[PDB]
Amino acid sequence: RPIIAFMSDLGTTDDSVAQCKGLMYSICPDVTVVDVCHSMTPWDVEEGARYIVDLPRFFPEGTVFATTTYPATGTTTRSVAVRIKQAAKGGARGQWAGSGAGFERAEGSYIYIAPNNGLLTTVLEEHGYLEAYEVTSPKVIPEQPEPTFYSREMVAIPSAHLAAGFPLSEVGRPLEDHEIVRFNRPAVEQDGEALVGVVSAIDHPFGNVWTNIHRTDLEKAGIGYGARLRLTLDGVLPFEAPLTPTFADAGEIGNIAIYLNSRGYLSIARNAASLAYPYHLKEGMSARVEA
Amino acid sequence: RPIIAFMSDLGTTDDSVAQCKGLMYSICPDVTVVDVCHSMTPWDVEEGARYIVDLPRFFPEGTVFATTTYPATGTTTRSVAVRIKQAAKGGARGQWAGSGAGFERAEGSYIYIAPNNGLLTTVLEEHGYLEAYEVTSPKVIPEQPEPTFYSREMVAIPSAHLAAGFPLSEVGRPLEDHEIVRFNRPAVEQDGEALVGVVSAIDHPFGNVWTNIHRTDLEKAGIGYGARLRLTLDGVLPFEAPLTPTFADAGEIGNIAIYLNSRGYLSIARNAASLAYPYHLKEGMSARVEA
Amino acid sequence: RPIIAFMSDLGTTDDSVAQCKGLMYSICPDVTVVDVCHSMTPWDVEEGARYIVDLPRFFPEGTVFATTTYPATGTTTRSVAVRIKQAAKGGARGQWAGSGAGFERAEGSYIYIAPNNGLLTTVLEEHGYLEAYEVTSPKVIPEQPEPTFYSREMVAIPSAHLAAGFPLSEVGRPLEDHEIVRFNRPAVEQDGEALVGVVSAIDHPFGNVWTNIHRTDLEKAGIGYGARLRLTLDGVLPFEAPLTPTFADAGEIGNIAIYLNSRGYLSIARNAASLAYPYHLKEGMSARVEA
Amino acid sequence: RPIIAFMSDLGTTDDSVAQCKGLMYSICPDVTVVDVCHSMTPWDVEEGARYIVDLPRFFPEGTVFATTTYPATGTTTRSVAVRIKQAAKGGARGQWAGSGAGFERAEGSYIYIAPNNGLLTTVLEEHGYLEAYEVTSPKVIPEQPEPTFYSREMVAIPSAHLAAGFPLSEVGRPLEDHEIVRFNRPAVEQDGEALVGVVSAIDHPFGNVWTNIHRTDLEKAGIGYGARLRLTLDGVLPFEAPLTPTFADAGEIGNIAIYLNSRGYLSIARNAASLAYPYHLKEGMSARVEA
Amino acid sequence: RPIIAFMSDLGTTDDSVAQCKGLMYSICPDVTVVDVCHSMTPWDVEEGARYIVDLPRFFPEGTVFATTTYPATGTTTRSVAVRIKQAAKGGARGQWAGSGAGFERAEGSYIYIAPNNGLLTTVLEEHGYLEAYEVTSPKVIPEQPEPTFYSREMVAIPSAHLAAGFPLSEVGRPLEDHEIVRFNRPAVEQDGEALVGVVSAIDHPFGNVWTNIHRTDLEKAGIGYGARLRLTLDGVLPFEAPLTPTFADAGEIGNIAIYLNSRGYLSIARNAASLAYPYHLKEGMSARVEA
Amino acid sequence: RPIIAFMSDLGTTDDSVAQCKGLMYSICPDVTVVDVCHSMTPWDVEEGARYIVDLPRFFPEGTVFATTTYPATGTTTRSVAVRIKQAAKGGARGQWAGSGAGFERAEGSYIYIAPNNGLLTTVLEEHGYLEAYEVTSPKVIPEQPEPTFYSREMVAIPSAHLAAGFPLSEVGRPLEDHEIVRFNRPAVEQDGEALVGVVSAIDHPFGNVWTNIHRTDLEKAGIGYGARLRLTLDGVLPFEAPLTPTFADAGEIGNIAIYLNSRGYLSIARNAASLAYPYHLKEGMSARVEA
Ligand SMILES: Nc1ncnc2c1ncn2[C@@H]1O[C@H](CF)[C@@H](O)[C@H]1O
Numbered sequence A, B, C, D, E, F: 001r002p003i004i005a006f007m008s009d010l011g012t013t014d015d016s017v018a019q020c021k022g023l024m025y026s027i028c029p030d031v032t033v034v035d036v037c038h039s040m041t042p043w044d045v046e047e048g049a050r051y052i053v054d055l056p057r058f059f060p061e062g063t064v065f066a067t068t069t070y071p072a073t074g075t076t077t078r079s080v081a082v083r084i085k086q087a088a089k090g091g092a093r094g095q096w097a098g099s100g101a102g103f104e105r106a107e108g109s110y111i112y113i114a115p116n117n118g119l120l121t122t123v124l125e126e127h128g129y130l131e132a133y134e135v136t137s138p139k140v141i142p143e144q145p146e147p148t149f150y151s152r153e154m155v156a157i158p159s160a161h162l163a164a165g166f167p168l169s170e171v172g173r174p175l176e177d178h179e180i181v182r183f184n185r186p187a188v189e190q191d192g193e194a195l196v197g198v199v200s201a202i203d204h205p206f207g208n209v210w211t212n213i214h215r216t217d218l219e220k221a222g223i224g225y226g227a228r229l230r231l232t233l234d235g236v237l238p239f240e241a242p243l244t245p246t247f248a249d250a251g252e253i254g255n256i257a258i259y260l261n262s263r264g265y266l267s268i269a270r271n272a273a274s275l276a277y278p279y280h281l282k283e284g285m286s287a288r289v290e291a
């Protein structure tokens, strides 16, 4: 009973996703196709990455992630399929997802198939990989790919073949590490004991504000759950609050909460109100934090 | 073949819904997960309720409704799980749903699991219940729950255990009626022959206008299909038309129709044009009807 | 393993689609309901037709297409249900969908059920039909249908009975060809040797621009892939470029590609950048093209 | 434009072949069905094999060979489908087929589907194979197969699915080499300088006589075009003539020609008269050659 | 992509069939012409009927059957074209042909054109008809028909016009039921619980023996698949065997098998050997069966 | 939509024809190969000529006729390829083939390719020719042709190149009229006012008897349709009857018709009964006829 979890930039306004879904049931009739999300900003591979990197621990082993934004559609470029290593713990503590102590997940248990455009950068950085292959076999892609729709032709279609049991090694030749494209993610800067980063994203639809300053960064400045923090956004907004587990820890509705979000990252928001929407806060603004 | 129908405020712009889905297929491999909607205004429990209250009669017996907006996420509060009594007839006429005479649903046949923040107020009012429990058992919720994601930890996850056959009485201790939180429903006031109420919702994406004046409120004042009616929104804009069953009864395209919506409530629209969107009509505006 | 592909104008903001789905599982427990889209402009039948005409070749044989915008809901109008003939090749080339040489589809393999309001016009043109029937039988629609929800009562419910094996000829009497409503499809004219049409659509979320000028109109206007073309939109904005297979053929990010889309029609875009949103381009604007 | 070349023992005296053809055009509407022959002696798998073993190099890449005599029809046996390796050169000289230097055929380019009764023995010997599967999947064969017509149910029908693009590995589980049934080919014996063999076939409708002594058997004993040869059929009738490439080399009409047939095998005939038919020569009779 | 399936008595020894085929591509250039068979005993309309009555379920809807033996060639007789009603299930069980549960076929979906000499007798008896017409219009037949070749002039030619879309109703005036010629088929006699019929045919090239005692006759004597039967042929040959699905159920090669043939009729044969050819069994000999 | 009409002496008992066809689709993928016949007496060039002379008026313009018996296969002989002139009326009357007034065929519209052994004699007499060429070019025949299969190497392969548009004049040098081999066609003599010829053919499968005495020989012997005729065959068997248009003109089943066949020549038959097989009549027997 195999699952393909499908993340694209195709939107949900026309029949493009359905076209892929139809081909997924044509090829693997007993497949369950779980939508991740299709709303991402087109061609923004750093954002697409955000929506896929935390997925594996939540799915049954054998799940295939089909993840694509494909600006080089119609070119000699060919996709990449990789088996990941660690399923990886996650969240604010670092733990397995699920009831009890959680579903512990085996190694080598999930496959990603994506354009070779850097979309899987963080996936590989945070999980590792056991093997990678270029996707060129006409048993899993079309002989005549539709030039402008490689997200269906070089991702959806082969993802269903893999989901139906088609051997990963037979999709094409192995790829060396340097042949897999990456983007570089900027580091969290240091010193003064302060940490300098950015707003990775606005957490829709709440308007929470997410930074790229991970828990591991907070640790190794000695920052923990009682610490009176000062987090400055956009160079001019020095918010001040203790680091708390959650939103209601700020007291009244509307108050400020500095917390670790559900993916392990330092964040700021308001208790049952929007921080970012009234003040038009945006991804890309700076983010410093300190004692 | 179990189903879980899933209503949240999580949105469809990132992978949050998909994390919960991955866990629901993990716990209950045969499940079908049906999306209700994930767009509701965050923290707005009266809005959440309109999306879930009419559902039971449409779904197969056995269906579980995971319904969640969780502003108290990370606190010591705990979710509630209830087996509802009557599936209840609905619509502008009062009937079972489906082809023929409709599909009649046995009592005690559906379970809702939600935050105990009042979300189920209208569900309980309209359907009753046979049993209620606080959801505390580490067999159906995580030992270490993610503080900012209780909609996944305390609704999505145990909704999957219930779909799988985990006995309802084993999720936690019984809740007494007064321990279940409720919102107060603003009453429809009498004021001469005029019934005063409120625009409960704009009916997206058409721009139809729904009030909280029920058909039982109408057939209390002797108003039935065919009476001429004045209807005053925001105190200032009145509207005259007969009460008809549907939009095409208004004559030309654009003409005003006053009707009973598919949930039994008095409503007003234009025939195949939007009424709300040109005039920026909004929920919360008053609504006065009179014959 | 039956499939229903569901296209409506119901939106995804409330529980309307899910009520339809609940009754689809009720009637055909083993069904898979695939969403096409639900975001279309209400009552815009030409737009609905673009989202459903190209689907068949992507879906397993036996698939039912529930496709509906129902402005006449509550009237004595009754739906139409057809078995189409040729599943029809598509795309820029004119091929079957799938890996390798694509998957061919036996004729008479798909049913569309829809309102008799012309929504199926282009499906019938592009595919032909073997049978067509009024949907009146109480075995497959309600005896007392909800006046304002015919997309559920005369499309969603019937489609499920058909997915479950219910005989197509038993839904009601046959219709003759003249009783199937069509919208007339405005032709691409010639003003000299320049071709004159409309922007059929803004291809969200990318902001590409699609025209109603087909590949067949370019052939025997004497226009193939080398040709240098002047495209003018709204009778104001001119753009120049050769006709290419795809976006990256235009060179640098931001440059103009004029190309043929995955449905066969002349289109225009920027390479990995939006063209429609900065210049606020829209559906319905004239589109002229010369060599 | 897919082709299926169809070899059976069904005859051409009733509609049996046409039932299979009707189903092949049904499943794969673009197919061209090319008859091989339908006259073979029923149940004679060695005869069937000579008609199908030399075919691949003549046909376009992609061609599917439905080849069937099914004495085990109605039993639990199941057909085999194999992608052959080399198209292989052939003829009296060894070459690709066609105009010019001939049409060279890529490896892995043809599929045979047959009963697993040994029919493909010489195909596998002469062409090899890359993959083999048992044909069990109810997507390519009937749920309730007609007991006395497996050549239609388990060859003709799935041959059409394969022509249509149904993935070869999805027809059933992999077969290991020893699970593929084989007939034992009687060897050409050495006996001094004399090579002993057998008349493999009468070459209808000319009455030429074919042996199972190959050219590699000849050019093993140093015999080439021009040597004087004695050839003894049925132990008693000898024949003296030089080995020439063709019939006209024998001189007058009626004279004896010993030659290499178009399949590389040593043969004997008369120049523009029948040799077999006057003397009632027959397959199975011995054949001894010597220089 | 229309199909004409062509059954004649013209043989395959000269160019007569080709002459018809040439005219079929002249008139409907995109036609596929499928040979049924051309070997039938000239003027034997009962045999010709046997080769056409089971065809419809095997072909795509819209197929035209052109079926002719024409002893009244050169007379004032004119052919008949009929649309049939039921495509009809068939075989030993009674089922649709094809993979899975089979291709279900619409009503009114096939046309037969034949001399009005009784050739279509069983076609009409087993399928029914919706309309019949005499073939007299000079748009579909010659003004000057070749006196001795009405199988080309009054069948092949008009069959291609119909295949090209020419309206059936416009070939000539409607025919009343009594104006369509029939031959009478002898009933299967009854009583003693024994059933008395004949050998309908010898199943070439195997030498199986077919009777006119259908499955429906066997049913309603209570005869099924375990029954120890006694079938006497030619008044003197009381064969004795159980009724089995197929040939291999008799055990050793050469043993007797009483089975239901692939058209639903009681038959007798040997397991991988000829019953009829060694003993010169013939169509027309008697056939009784019993406990 | 090119057509090759294929007449050979290859028979239908092995894969010889199909090897030819495989290479025909290889060379001209969009071709339709129509079989004329393959059952002719090997090497009997007069008989081959009767099966091909009357074909052109039945076939779409542009059709290629691959017609071959090749007793000189393997020699330095090279095929001939001609474009004929008049497509020529035919039949008993002298008309165009087809519905209505028949279809006229432009001159220079058909090519025959055949061995230069006289097979084309009557085609050239009856049709004339505009060009004639030796087939020697390596673009259209093999460089190393199979010695015993020139019907495939110098007829089948070349015919496909010609069907695909290959220029006729480029196959090799032109031939002058004397270099095209003819068989001399034995004349119908007069012994007084009685006419003396041969049975040209037994018209299988009916057993009618065809003579080499044409309609033109009957005209100005003073013999039209009323005339009472004494036909004598083999110089022994006498038959008497008037000349009639067709078979049923003879009255009762079994009676003698003397008539004119669909190719224009005096013939004799029984009405709906065989004449040749009971009396074992044969090709080559004398045929005398007087009034
Ligand atoms: N305008 C565009 N420029 C470059 N790439 C584009 C554009 N519009 C859409 N795409 C990509 O096409 C792929 C189809 F598979 C989608 O994933 C888009 O990223």
Ligand SMILES: Nc1ncnc2c1ncn2[C@@H]1O[C@H](CF)[C@@H](O)[C@H]1O
Pocket: A206, A208, A247, A248, A269, A270, A271, A272, A273, B008, B009, B010, B042, B043, B068, B069, B070, B071, B072, B073, B148, B149, B150, B151, B152
């Ligand atoms: N900013 C927020 N304040 C209070 N609650 C919030 C906030 N953002 C999201 N939530 C709730 O967290 C739950 C996690 F499951 C979601 O359902 C939101 O209702």
Ligand SMILES: Nc1ncnc2c1ncn2[C@@H]1O[C@H](CF)[C@@H](O)[C@H]1O
Pocket: B206, B208, B247, B248, B269, B270, B271, B272, B273, C009, C010, C042, C043, C068, C069, C070, C071, C072, C073, C148, C149, C150, C151, C152
């Ligand atoms: N205001 C409206 N006028 C006419 N039709 C409407 C209006 N609002 C919604 N609808 C249609 O009701 C159908 C219910 F099934 C939906 O498909 C809408 O198209």
Ligand SMILES: Nc1ncnc2c1ncn2[C@@H]1O[C@H](CF)[C@@H](O)[C@H]1O
Pocket: D008, D009, D010, D042, D043, D068, D069, D070, D071, D072, D073, D148, D149, D150, D151, D152, E206, E208, E247, E248, E269, E270, E271, E272, E273
């Ligand atoms: N009499 C027969 N015994 C065993 N097999 C048979 C017999 N007659 C026909 N067959 C086989 O049935 C298959 C049906 F598809 C044909 O291919 C025959 O080989």
Ligand SMILES: Nc1ncnc2c1ncn2[C@@H]1O[C@H](CF)[C@@H](O)[C@H]1O
Pocket: E009, E010, E042, E043, E068, E069, E070, E071, E072, E073, E148, E149, E150, E151, E152, F206, F208, F247, F248, F269, F270, F271, F272, F273, F274
């Ligand atoms: N000898 C014949 N008597 C009566 N009919 C005949 C005879 N020979 C052939 N035919 C019929 O001619 C038709 C030509 F269309 C064929 O279908 C034969 O049935």
Ligand SMILES: Nc1ncnc2c1ncn2[C@@H]1O[C@H](CF)[C@@H](O)[C@H]1O
Pocket: D206, D208, D247, D248, D269, D270, D271, D272, D273, F009, F010, F042, F043, F068, F069, F070, F071, F072, F073, F148, F149, F150, F151, F152
């Ligand atoms: N025995 C034969 N002598 C001369 N020609 C022959 C003989 N047997 C077959 N053929 C011819 O070979 C050609 C191969 F293309 C066929 O057309 C036969 O006529």
Ligand code: MET
Pocket: A203, A204, A261, A262, A263, B010, B014, B016, B148, B149
């Ligand atoms: C904070 S509410 C939970 C959903 C949120 N988008 C998250 O990923 O954590």
Ligand code: MET
Pocket: B203, B204, B208, B261, B262, B263, C010, C014, C016, C148, C149
């Ligand atoms: C008004 S058209 C049907 C959809 C609408 N949202 C309803 O619930 O009734």
Ligand code: MET
Pocket: A010, A014, A016, A148, A149, C203, C204, C208, C261, C262, C263
């Ligand atoms: C242009 S990217 C592919 C999606 C687009 N909507 C299409 O169907 O062609």
Ligand code: MET
Pocket: D203, D204, D208, D261, D262, D263, F010, F014, F016, F148, F149
């Ligand atoms: C001998 S003439 C060519 C036809 C023959 N059957 C062959 O295969 O070679």
Ligand code: MET
Pocket: D010, D014, D016, D148, D149, E203, E204, E261, E262, E263
């Ligand atoms: C018994 S083998 C299958 C062919 C046979 N002539 C039939 O019609 O069933």
Ligand code: MET
Pocket: E010, E014, E016, E148, E149, F203, F204, F208, F261, F262, F263
């Ligand atoms: C005599 S019935 C028609 C077929 C016959 N062979 C002919 O061509 O005339």
